[PDB]
Design a protein around this ligand. Structure first.
Ligand SMILES: OC[C@@H]1[C@@H](O)[C@H](O)[C@@H](O)[C@H]2N[C@@H]12
Ligand SMILES: O=C([O-])C(=O)[O-]
Length: 780
């Protein structure tokens, strides 16, 4: 039994007193509120909030039975007796406390009937997690396939079909019960830690996500090279093997930006060496030369590191001496028995641990390392009596990887202010995207079921802040022989998901260059396609930095008033314009694609489909997976290069999918130097915009460029615009007032400036796109 006693306004926050204690309500923006219970007491600080100190001016009003605390769009309605807070956007009820806060830490809320709930981070349970209960304790799930209640990267957060996100801003071992035990109750629980939640509201899913990343953090633009081709396995055993792999990409004509070194870079065995954090010189004898030789070919080197220092490692005595390891209650370094052997964990929450670990990353980065892979950050083993500077293991567990990322990000920015950090990690917390975290879905089995789960995992993580969530392409764990069809399908899917990193245990090759002739003939043009599409992908990345819009978007974005689409995990959007349906079983001869109402083109064949609502059935083939292009799309391409270090946009090729059903369309292409972390902040970019206006007798394109440019930006780009489904009735083209005849023959066979191909229904315009505005008008 709880009731309101009294309140006050202090530094813009509402502090309420009940019979049980203080409750602090601070608006972190007009659409987001932090509710801290036990506000009087000492607690762990917020991990989820980018600006935990902020509180914007809100309006407070009082009635007999209630208080009302409001920002722009979000309102807290505080019932006094009994005490219960509920939340409104306009006058629409978003979420209501049932018992609310109790004692262990426990929050209880009502779920509305029919409300669907996404959330929890990585689980394989279905997109709507209502009816499920699961722990909040990051933990490995080696060899998962088609089911998991608990894996590497949980998030104490949910997204509802009422268009709110609720964050449990707590780092401890806990649980979430989403109307499982009691059908109308959402229950959040933890053994300890901060007793706070954060509610964020939005008018649409895009703007919900914008509001969420506003308060939790925006991912800084990764380096363009993160969108390229990675060579990775577990693991290259030597410098010779690593050089041979870079050579294999060159001799097989596959693009390659980055080679990834797993744990053999620091010792010859899986066990016994972890914590060395230095080169195994028997097997990597000249590593500075190795890395420099790779940079000459435009190839970056990424190294694996882990949180654990073994007692057999060369750095045990030094870490103990520096007080860098987590301790037992007696105050000594805690040691425990990992797979790898007996060892400790670096205390990233301490000053000494942070300085010690940072110094090692600084040293190796000085040697030539371009980026970093932090594995086992759950932490994979984390005994409960381990003591970190700010709490015990069970209290801090779900924030360890988050602080690891923060530490490393700040260190990389301090060492290289002019470069974008690359940080790939397996486990984090809400807001870890602000430290550049690029997560992957862990040790997936080499099975169709492991592939079939990747879209679900990717969308769940994308929706709550993680644009660059990806998988070990081709699968990671076990297998005795390559499943060639599954491998091909996983790497085709790869092209249309955030990071192109095939990776597997090295008894079966993960890299496409080591595959048979048929597999390489299929995949080589697709990996080249990934490079030709960099302007599309990099522009979606730019949008993710600006607004949190994920790269992969769920089918349900296409119709916000049809909540049944929330269940789909088999088709998704890659950027604005491509509806992708990965093939996730062997021998599938056709697929039924639940395309939204409108006009759609076969990405591979140019075929036009119109649909009222009924799904489209497309046949399948082994060389592609089904991709449809939305009418009104602008798809930008550049020529394929071997490495993004060679990237040029001097030549553009843009494909516009015309249909009279889309009278107005827009596209953009974001160009910058691909490496400067301050490019967007300082407007050191070239933002190309394109607008189409499509009426009965004309098709008009308006082209423009903004921003201050960047060093090496071409002043003039040779541009080929290919208009698919173009009317055969266009008589002439006006370019900036200058009339040009449209040729009706020999388009492919003459240096034609405007040419209509009657057999393909494609009108091709070739022109120079300079810094001034350009208008292209086609008239019947
Ligand atoms: O470090 C070896 C291996 C790594 O390649 C995978 O990416 C990780 O998830 C952990 N299983 C380990
Ligand atoms: O729709 C058009 O503009 C046409 O096909 O002629």
């Amino acid at each position: 039994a709880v009731f309101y006693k009294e309140h006050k306004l202090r530094n813009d926050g509402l502090v309420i007193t009940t019979n049980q204690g203080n409750i602090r309500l601070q608006f972190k923006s007009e659409a987001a509120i932090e509710v801290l219970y036990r506000a009087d007491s000492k607690q762990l600080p917020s991990f989820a909030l980018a600006q935990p100190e902020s509180a914007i001016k809100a309006q407070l009003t009082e009635t007999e039975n209630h208080l009302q605390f409001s920002g722009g769009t979000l309102t807290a309605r505080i019932q006094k007796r009994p005490f219960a807070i509920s939340y409104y956007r306009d006058s629409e009820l978003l979420l209501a406390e049932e018992s609310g806060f109790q004692v262990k830490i426990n929050f209880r809320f009502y779920l509305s009937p029919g409300e669907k709930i996404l959330g929890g981070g990585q689980r394989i349970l279905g997109m709507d997690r209502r009816g499920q209960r699961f722990p909040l304790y990051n933990r490995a799930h080696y060899g998962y396939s088609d089911h998991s209640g608990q894996m590497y990267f949980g998030l104490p957060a949910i997204m509802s079909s009422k268009q709110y996100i609720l964050v449990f801003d707590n780092s401890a071992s806990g649980a979430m019960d989403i109307g499982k035990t009691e059908s109308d109750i959402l229950q959040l629980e933890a053994k300890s830690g901060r007793s706070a939640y954060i509610l964020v509201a939005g008018n649409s899913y895009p703007s919900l996500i914008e509001n969420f990343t506003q308060v939790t953090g925006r991912q800084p633009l990764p380096p363009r090279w993160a969108l390229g081709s990675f060579a990775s396995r577990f693991g290259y055993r030597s410098e010779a093997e690593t050089r041979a792999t870079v050579q294999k990409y060159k001799t097989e004509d596959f693009p390659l930006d980055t080679i990834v070194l797993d744990l053999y870079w620091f010792g010859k065995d899986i066990k016994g060496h972890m914590g060395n954090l230095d080169w195994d010189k028997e097997n990597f004898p000249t590593p500075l030369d190795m890395m420099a030789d790779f940079k000459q070919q435009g190839v970056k080197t990424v190294l694996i590191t882990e949180p654990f220092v073994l007692t057999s490692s060369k750095r045990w005595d030094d870490a103990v001496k520096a007080k860098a390891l987590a301790k037992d209650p007696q105050g000594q370094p805690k040691a425990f028995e990992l797979y790898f052997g007996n060892g400790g964990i670096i205390d990233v929450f301490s000053k000494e641990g942070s300085r010690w670990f940072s110094s090692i990353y600084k040293d190796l980065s000085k040697q030539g390392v371009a980026g970093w892979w932090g594995n086992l950050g759950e932490p994979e083993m984390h005994p409960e009596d381990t003591q970190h500077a700010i709490g015990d293991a069970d209290t801090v567990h779900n924030a360890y990887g988050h602080r690891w990322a923060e530490m490393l990000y700040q260190q990389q920015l301090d060492q290289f202010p002019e470069l974008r950090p690359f940080i790939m990690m397996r486990a984090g917390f809400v807001g870890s995207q602000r430290y550049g975290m690029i997560p992957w879905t862990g040790d997936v089995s080499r099975t169709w079921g492991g592939l079939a789960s990747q879209v679900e995992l990717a969308l769940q993580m994308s929706l709550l802040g993680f644009g660059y969530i990806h998988s070990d392409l081709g699968g990671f764990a076990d297998g005795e022989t390559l499943d060639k069809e599954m491998y091909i399908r996983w790497l085709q899917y790869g092209v249309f998901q955030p990071v192109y990193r095939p990776h597997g245990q090295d008894h079966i090759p993960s890299e496409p260059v080591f595959q048979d002739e048929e597999t390489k003939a299929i995949l080589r043009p697709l990996v080249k396609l990934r490079y030709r599409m960099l302007p599309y992908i990099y522009t979606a990345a730019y949008q993710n930095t600006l607004t949190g819009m994920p790269l992969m978007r769920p089918l349900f974005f296409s119709d916000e008033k049809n909540p049944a689409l929330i269940d789909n995990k088999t088709s998704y959007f890659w950027g604005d314009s491509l509806l992708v349906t990965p093939i996730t079983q062997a021998g599938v001869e056709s697929v039924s694609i639940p395309a939204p109402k409108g006009v759609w083109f076969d990405f591979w064949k140019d075929t036009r489909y119109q649909t009222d609502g009924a799904p489209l059935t497309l046949p399948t083939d082994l060389h592609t997976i089904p991709v449809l292009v939305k009418a009104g799309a602008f798809m930008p391409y550049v020529p394929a290069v071997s490495t993004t270090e060679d990237y040029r946009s001097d030549s553009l090729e843009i494909h516009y999918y015309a249909d009279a059903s889309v009278p107005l369309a827009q596209g953009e292409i974001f160009e910058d130097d691909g490496k400067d972390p301050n490019s967007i902040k300082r407007n050191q970019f070239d933002l190309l915009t394109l607008q189409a206006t499509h009426t009965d007798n004309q098709l008009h394109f308006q082209l423009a460029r903004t921003g201050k440019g960047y060093r090496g930006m071409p002043e003039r780009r040779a541009t080929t615009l290919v208009i698919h489904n173009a009317s055969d009735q266009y008589q002439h083209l006006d370019i900036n007032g200058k009339t040009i005849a449209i040729a009706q023959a020999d388009c492919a066979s003459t240096p034609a400036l405007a040419c209509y191909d009657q057999e393909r229904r494609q009108l091709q315009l070739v022109f120079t796109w300079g810094r001034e505005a350009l208008n292209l008008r086609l008239h019947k």
